[PDB]
Design a protein around this ligand. Structure first.
Ligand SMILES: [Mg+2]
Length: 119
């Protein structure tokens, strides 16, 4: 239906979030790093992006800047550990639509994503 790009270097989290959003009946794209995320975002033009804060090499803040530059109206929702307070503040200052604290609440994930691109 709608296209969700899910970006995290962690296989278990990619698969968990894939499961949550495939069950909500979304079309999903998985990326393990910024290169894959930006190549997919350029070709697929997804309806939304779930973006991990901490990714080796190009981290979630540098990915967010590159997504919000090319396509400023795509909602980007961050995924973060609960004490990356300064990264949460920077991502929100840079126009992130939401952030989710780990450990993820499955109901929060479903509901916030459904609201941010389902009417
Ligand atoms: Mg990570």
């Amino acid at each position: 239906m709608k296209q969700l790009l899910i970006v995290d270097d962690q296989q278990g989290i990619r698969l968990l979030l894939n499961e949550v959003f495939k069950r909500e009946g979304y079309t999903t794209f998985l990326a393990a790093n910024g290169i894959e995320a930006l190549d997919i975002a350029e070709r697929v033009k997804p309806d939304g992006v779930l973006l991990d804060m901490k990714i080796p090499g190009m981290d979630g803040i540098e990915i967010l800047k590159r997504i919000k530059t090319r396509t400023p109206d795509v909602p980007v929702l961050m995924m973060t550990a609960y004490g990356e307070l300064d990264l949460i503040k920077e991502a929100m200052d840079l126009g992130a639509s939401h952030y989710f604290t780990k450990p993820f609440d499955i109901y929060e994930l479903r509901d916030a994503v459904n609201e941010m691109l389902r009417d």
